[PDB]
Write a protein that binds this ligand. Structure first.
Ligand SMILES: Nc1nc2c(ncn2[C@@H]2O[C@H](COP(=O)(O)OP(=O)(O)OP(=O)(O)O)[C@@H](O)[C@H]2O)c(=O)[nH]1
Ligand SMILES: Nc1ncnc2c1ncn2[C@@H]1O[C@H](COP(=O)(O)OP(=O)(O)CP(=O)(O)O)[C@@H](O)[C@H]1O
Ligand SMILES: Nc1nc2c(ncn2[C@@H]2O[C@H](COP(=O)(O)OP(=O)(O)O)[C@@H](O)[C@H]2O)c(=O)[nH]1
Ligand SMILES: COc1ccc(CN)cc1OC
Ligand SMILES: COc1ccc(CN)cc1OC
Ligand SMILES: [Ca+2]
Ligand SMILES: [Ca+2]
Ligand SMILES: [Ca+2]
Ligand SMILES: [Mg+2]
Ligand SMILES: [Mg+2]
Ligand SMILES: [Mg+2]
Lengths: 340, 421, 54, 438
């Protein structure tokens, strides 16, 4: 009979993991402040890692990697790529990015302007995005000054692959699970969050793919695919009927390569191999695909949710390879292990 | 030389006290005449904790036997180990206390208290460094209850900084001498709440149910009930009477068991209770099982503030640690979460007579409040009709004194109830 | 990766490797604390004795 | 030559001091009776070991140590044990009853009545010094004497020896080897009145020593003898520079200079490698690179924490045995490229290295195996604040209910001293976060 505590009530993924754990009859949930626990489904911000692994006789496990924010922060992910030799500043799958602190506060304002001036002079597309989209460096910098937090300016992919019919933009979400042993498992089930609006490269930020901006400011939500969510089975059949290529060949190889390159990069900094407690964590990778079928990394999410149709299978998988693998109970895996 | 002075008052007090010295005297190799005849130096290591050394290498218990009638102490002096007790240490009257708390505390007992304190003072003056006192008594009678608490009040006056512990036998209607036992117990609990540092509650109902249900004794007797108390008193004092990595006197043991001064009433437990070997897991499961506890309070009806576990015998201390953590980690909802690591374990390589290994449980649980709720209920059923009050008002007591003791015990209950939530 | 201040002797040596450059109470007051605590104990034992006298 | 007086307070301090002086004697070739055949200056001399051993005309080498305990059963061991001849009776002081794990009882009630006696014995050892450096204080955090009397002694030492340095070796409480529920109270009380008095403090988490004994030594249920013999090895690595010819950490002041650039953050982390089981058939001796790299594994730290998530203010490598400078730098170059070693901007990224050619001495029949080279790393990481965090949490849990407070108030301490001590711990954790996180 294992024990676990829940410190993130707002977790739709681990609210199901907690629902499934109790269903095994071999897992008992304790108060959020009870230290005699095996598994901590911890909070997002300020998770007390320093208090784990110090209970005599208790093997303790937590659902977050201490230090993984270096990868799930706009400004840190940029700094991680420009300074980590494993990724190099010449990284071909990450958009040209820059760290820009507001003038009311190192900073890359001058380095960003040098490259911006080179595009305007070279007749090349010079459309950027700060991140709460413009081709003039003046508006971008003036928008960040009007805010009080750190911002990052990265190139805007002006040639995104459009689905037909519709001429519409989209993005791909992959869920990656790293266990206590640091095996990198890629959930076979992805989702494309498409825009129900025809992409327009001359203007309105609705045709350029969040589920909240499409279901609020877009007027064609649920027209083509239900909930603006296209799954791999359909998107693959489209790649074959349209481009005469598969999803595994044209996109999936590049995605598996990006996931590996990022996670293997930070392994020496976040690994719990020789630590007094164990860590696992579920990640959400967001990619973009251009008309050349080249995959780009948008960002990585450390507390991602799952598509409604996949909550059952993925959460069950989190229990199999991340929880039961450390606390066994008394296939055909749904994950694609990325060996290394 | 951390010496403990022992006191036993009244019928129940002296009968239980007698079996106590009988049990540990056999553990330290002391014969009925006070001569040592053991084989392990570990027996004499801490022998002076409870025994004074006399001429000829004799060991005389550091015990003071007190009663208001000669009956019970005559039996002790003629009992098995009767010759072991210092003859001067028998201080007894003749009128008796008629199961009347007032007689023991105010009239008969008051006439005799000083001569008892002269003997205490004699035993303390021979102590190189007095640890503290311990009293065995019942609360339902007159002497051990009324005069027993009178002594405690005077010992705290003359030795205000010494630890005062009691082994207090609580009355139960299922094992009752008189209908006034609730009156005497309530009046005594009032004293104990104020003037003792630690009280080991022994509920005669638990002792009977154990003899009847568990031990399968058709018609249990006080002799049978007193065997359980002997074993528990011997187990509770194991780590005071023998060496080990534990370097703790009474005060240090109290500091770690009593988070709040008034909540110092413990549930004692013993395991086992026949030729089969009992595994370390079995010792742990029983020790925490309510049936193996003497307070007659189901711990699952409360929360443990602190728990001390003393294992005796040669066993895997690695396995003991595993099992203790297992009981804790598998029942963490019965331990207050605002006292980290409030469950401690001690081991002892010397088991009790006839046992390859054994366990003694010492719990400070808020479930003890149910014992005071029983007494308070029985007290009120009579007190609301002032029934049997004349026995006490005839000795100079006033009802107000009763109402105050009642209110102090009810507060104690409400106090246990706030730390249980 | 510079080494500096190398000292050697028969029983050992020591040095420093630089990888990158950078970027009370008096004896009177103690006696008062100790005596104040002692007075609070006396006052708490007096009230205990005063209680036992009643 | 400048003398160093060691002061061992309470059970933990006395027994650890026993394990250190046993080791110091094996290291300097000193027998239990105090004789030293190697010493050619009889009854005197200003050698390196003379910082820790005084000499009599009869050739006895007497430790410059004082043992203090409020109850006598622990120091009585020293009075009848193997090294009962090293110390003279004045050096060993004992009371009649302890502080009962009650800081207030050791600081106020009992401490008041015995502070002048201890200081008088210390003044005797100080009079035998031509140039006293300071004191090394050994004690536990959780003990009533170790916490209570130590902080009182530390206060008086600053008054009577203002121009002397004070080093602490403090045992951090671990539930696995402790029966004291109130240790968090005593730990934080002693840190409050001792923070502005210690110049450099080495914490030793018993949980860390416990797991090293189980993991590396194959001790299933480690005892105090096992823990202390290992703790004396690390302590020996730290005080070696004071007792042996050399140039790194020559005097106590150099510990503050090299390890404590910021005064209020004076708790360096200690890491030690290798720990080999003497019961092993035979181990393959580790190299300089391998033992150096081990210093960056938490499983070898005296306090469990994650240095990858703090910032270094100072890093000091102390080697004993067959170690040459070329091999040290080679290992350091490989660790920078692999490990996560972030220094604070206002401090240089560097390592002070000390090598002593004599390999570590192991107590015959002990648990540790003889090795050809060992290293102790001293690094001031903000990550050690995790240890304070854990303690603070336990303190807050009980103090919110005032559990056990009456015991302390009953010995004369005012309740406010609790929160005043806790607020000082909140101040301490604010400095560690200003120095580490961005
Ligand atoms: N490493 C180590 N820790 C010890 C040793 N002895 C006691 N401790 C630790 O010290 C804490 C208890 O404090 P003690 O030193 O025993 O108490 P004290 O200083 O003698 O003060 P008193 O309360 O008066 O007994 C516990 O956390 C123990 O784990 C020892 O020999 N070695
Ligand atoms: N460099 C770029 N070029 C083109 N489009 C981009 C882009 N960066 C972001 N986008 C658009 O913005 C969306 C991603 O936004 P982003 O992920 O930065 O915001 P967010 O973090 O609040 C959503 P999430 O839940 O994935 O974290 C994608 O749908 C994509 O269409
Ligand atoms: N366990 C136990 N309880 C007893 C014994 N004798 C009396 N009692 C209980 O103690 C109470 C009577 O008190 P008693 O000691 O006889 O009165 P006293 O002699 O005036 O102190 C009743 O509740 C009895 O059930 C005994 O030998 N063993
Ligand atoms: C390990 O021994 C003990 C533990 C706790 C208590 C209760 N304060 C008493 C003990 O021995 C009499
Ligand atoms: C076995 O249990 C104990 C042993 C010693 C002490 C005293 N520090 C307390 C204990 O339980 C609270
Ligand atoms: Ca009369
Ligand atoms: Ca000399
Ligand atoms: Ca100072
Ligand atoms: Mg996001
Ligand atoms: Mg009777
Ligand atoms: Mg002690």
């Amino acid at each position: 009979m294992y024990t676990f505590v829940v410190r993130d009530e707002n977790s739709s993924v681990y609210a199901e993991v907690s629902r499934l754990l109790l269903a095994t009859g071999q897992w008992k949930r304790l108060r959020k402040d009870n230290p005699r626990f095996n598994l901590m489904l911890g909070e997002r911000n300020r998770l007390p890692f320093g208090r784990l692994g110090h209970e005599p006789g208790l093997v303790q496990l937590v659902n977050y990697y201490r230090g993984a924010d270096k990868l799930c922060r706009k400004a840190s992910l940029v700094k991680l790529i420009k300074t980590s030799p494993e990724l190099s500043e010449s990284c071909t799958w990450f958009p040209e990015s820059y760290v820009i602190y507001p003038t009311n506060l190192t900073d890359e304002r001058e380095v960003f302007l040098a490259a911006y001036n080179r595009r305007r002079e070279g007749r090349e597309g010079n459309v950027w995005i700060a991140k709460g989209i413009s081709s003039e460096a003046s508006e971008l910098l003036d928008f960040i000054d009007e805010q009080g937090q750190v911002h990052v300016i990265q190139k805007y992919l002006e040639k995104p692959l459009l689905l037909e019919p519709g001429h519409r933009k989209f993005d791909i979400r992959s869920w990656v699970l790293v266990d206590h042993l640091y095996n990198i498992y890629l959930y076979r089930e992805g989702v494309l969050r498409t825009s129900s609006e025809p992409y327009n490269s001359a203007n309105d930020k609705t045709c350029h793919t969040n589920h909240c901006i499409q279901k609020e400011y877009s007027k064609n939500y649920g027209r083509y695919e239900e909930g603006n969510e296209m799954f791999f089975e359909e998107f693959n059949q489209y790649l074959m009927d349209a481009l005469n290529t598969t999803l595994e060949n044209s996109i999936l190889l590049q995605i598996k390569h990006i996931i590996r390159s990022c996670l293997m990069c930070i392994e020496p900094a976040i690994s719990t191999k020789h630590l007094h407690y164990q860590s696992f964590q579920l990640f959400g990778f967001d990619f973009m695909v251009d008309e050349e079928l080249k995959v780009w990394l948008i960002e990585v999410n450390g507390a991602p949710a799952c598509a409604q149709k996949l909550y059952a299978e993925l959460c069950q998988g989190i229990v199999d390879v991340a929880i039961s693998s450390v606390f066994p109970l008394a296939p055909t895996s749904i994950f694609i292990k990325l060996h290394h | 030389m951390r010496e403990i002075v022992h006191i036993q008052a009244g019928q129940c007090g002296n009968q239980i006290g007698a079996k106590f010295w009988e049990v540990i005297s056999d553990e330290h190799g002391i014969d009925p005449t006070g001569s040592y005849h053991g084989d392990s130096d570990l027996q004499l290591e801490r022998i002076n904790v409870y025994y004074n050394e006399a001429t000829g290498n004799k060991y005389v218990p550091r015990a003071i036997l007190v009663d208001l009638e000669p009956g019970t102490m005559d039996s002790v002096r003629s009992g098995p180990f009767g010759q072991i007790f210092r003859p001067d240490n028998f201080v007894f009257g003749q009128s008796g206390a008629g199961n009347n708390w007032a007689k023991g505390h105010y009239t008969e007992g008051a006439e005799l208290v000083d001569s008892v304190l002269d003997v205490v003072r004699k035993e303390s003056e021979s102590c190189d460094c007095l640890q503290g006192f311990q009293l065995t008594h019942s609360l339902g009678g007159g002497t051990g209850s009324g005069m027993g608490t009178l002594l405690i009040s005077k010992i705290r006056e003359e030795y205000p900084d010494r630890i005062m512990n009691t082994f207090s036998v609580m009355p139960s209607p299922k094992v009752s001498d008189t209908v006034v036992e609730p009156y005497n117990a309530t009046l005594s609990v009032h004293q104990l709440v104020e003037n003792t540092d630690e009280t080991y509650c022994i509920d005669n109902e638990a002792l009977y149910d154990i003899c009847f249900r568990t031990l399968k004794l058709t018609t249990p007797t006080y002799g049978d009930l007193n065997h359980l108390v002997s074993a528990t008193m011997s187990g509770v004092t194991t780590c005071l009477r023998f060496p080990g990595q534990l370097n703790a006197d009474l005060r240090k043991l109290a500091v770690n068991m009593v988070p709040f001064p008034r909540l110092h009433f413990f549930m004692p437990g013993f395991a086992p209770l026949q030729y089969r070997a009992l595994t370390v897991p079995e010792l742990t499961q029983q020790m925490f099982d309510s049936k193996n506890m003497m307070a007659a309070c189901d711990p699952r009806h409360g929360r443990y503030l602190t728990v001390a576990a003393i294992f005796r015998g040669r066993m895997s201390m690695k396995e003991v640690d595993e099992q203790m953590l297992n009981v804790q980690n598998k029942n963490s909802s019965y331990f207050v979460e605002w006292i980290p690591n409030n469950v401690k374990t001690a081991v002892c390589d010397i088991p009790p007579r006839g046992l390859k290994m054994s366990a003694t449980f010492i719990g400070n649980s808020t479930a003890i409040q149910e014992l005071f709720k029983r007494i308070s209920e029985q007290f009120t059923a009579m007190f609301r009709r002032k029934a049997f009050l004349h026995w006490y008002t005839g000795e100079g007591m006033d009802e107000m004194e009763f109402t105050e003791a009642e209110s102090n015990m009810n507060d104690l209950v409400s106090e246990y109830q706030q730390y249980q939530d | 990766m510079e080494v500096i201040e190398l000292n050697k002797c028969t029983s050992g040596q020591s040095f420093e490797v630089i990888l990158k450059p950078p970027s009370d109470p008096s004896l009177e007051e103690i006696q008062k604390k100790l005596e104040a605590a002692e007075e609070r104990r006396k006052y708490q034992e007096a009230e205990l004795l005063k209680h036992l006298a009643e | 030559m400048r003398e160093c007086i060691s002061i061992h307070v309470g059970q933990a301090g006395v027994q650890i001091g026993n394990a250190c002086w046993e080791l110091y004697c094996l290291e300097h070739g000193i027998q239990p009776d105090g004789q030293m055949p190697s010493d050619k200056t009889i009854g005197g001399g200003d050698d390196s070991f003379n910082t820790f051993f005084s000499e009599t005309g009869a050739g006895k080498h007497v430790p410059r140590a004082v043992f203090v305990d409020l109850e006598p059963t622990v120091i009585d061991e020293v009075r009848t044990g193997t090294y009962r001849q090293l110390f003279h009776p004045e050096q060993l002081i004992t009371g009649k009853e302890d502080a009962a794990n009650n800081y207030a009882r050791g600081h106020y009630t009992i401490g008041k009545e015995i502070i002048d006696l201890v200081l008088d014995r210390i003044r005797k050892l100080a009079d035998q010094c031509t140039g006293l450096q300071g004191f090394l204080v050994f004690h536990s955090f959780g003990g009533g004497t170790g916490s209570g009397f130590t902080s009182l002694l530390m206060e008086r030492l600053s008054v009577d020896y203002g121009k002397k340095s004070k080093l602490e070796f403090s045992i951090y409480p671990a539930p696995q080897v402790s029966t004291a529920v109130v240790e968090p109270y005593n730990s934080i009380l002693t840190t409050h009145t001792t923070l502005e008095h210690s110049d450099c403090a080495f914490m030793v988490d018993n949980e860390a020593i416990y797991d090293i004994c189980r993991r590396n030594l194959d001790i299933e249920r480690p005892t105090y003898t096992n823990l202390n013999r290992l703790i004396s090895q690390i302590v020996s690595s730290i005080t070696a520079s004071l007792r042996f010819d050399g140039a790194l950490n020559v005097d106590l002041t150099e510990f503050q200079t090299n390890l404590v650039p910021y005064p209020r953050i004076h708790f360096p982390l200690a890491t030690y490698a290798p720990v080999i089981s003497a019961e092993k058939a035979y181990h393959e001796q580790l190299s300089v690179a391998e033992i150096t790299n081990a210093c960056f594994e938490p499983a070898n730290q005296m306090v469990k924490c994650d240095p990858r998530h703090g910032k270094y203010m100072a890093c000091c490598l102390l080697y004993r045995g067959d170690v040459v400078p070329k091999d040290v730098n080679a290992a350091i170059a490989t660790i920078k490229t692999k490990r996560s070693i972030q220094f604070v901007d206002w401090c240089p990224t560097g390592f002070k290295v000390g090598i002593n050619y004599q390999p570590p001495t192991v107590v015959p029949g002990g648990d540790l195996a003889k090795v050809q080279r060992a290293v102790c790393m001293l690094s001031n990481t903000t990550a050690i604040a995790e240890a304070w965090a854990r303690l603070d949490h336990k303190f807050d849990l009980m103090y919110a209910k005032r559990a056990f407070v009456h015991w302390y108030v009953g010995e004369g301490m005012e309740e406010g001293e609790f929160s005043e001590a806790r607020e000082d711990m909140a101040a301490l954790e604010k400095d560690y976060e200003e120095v580490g996180v961005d």
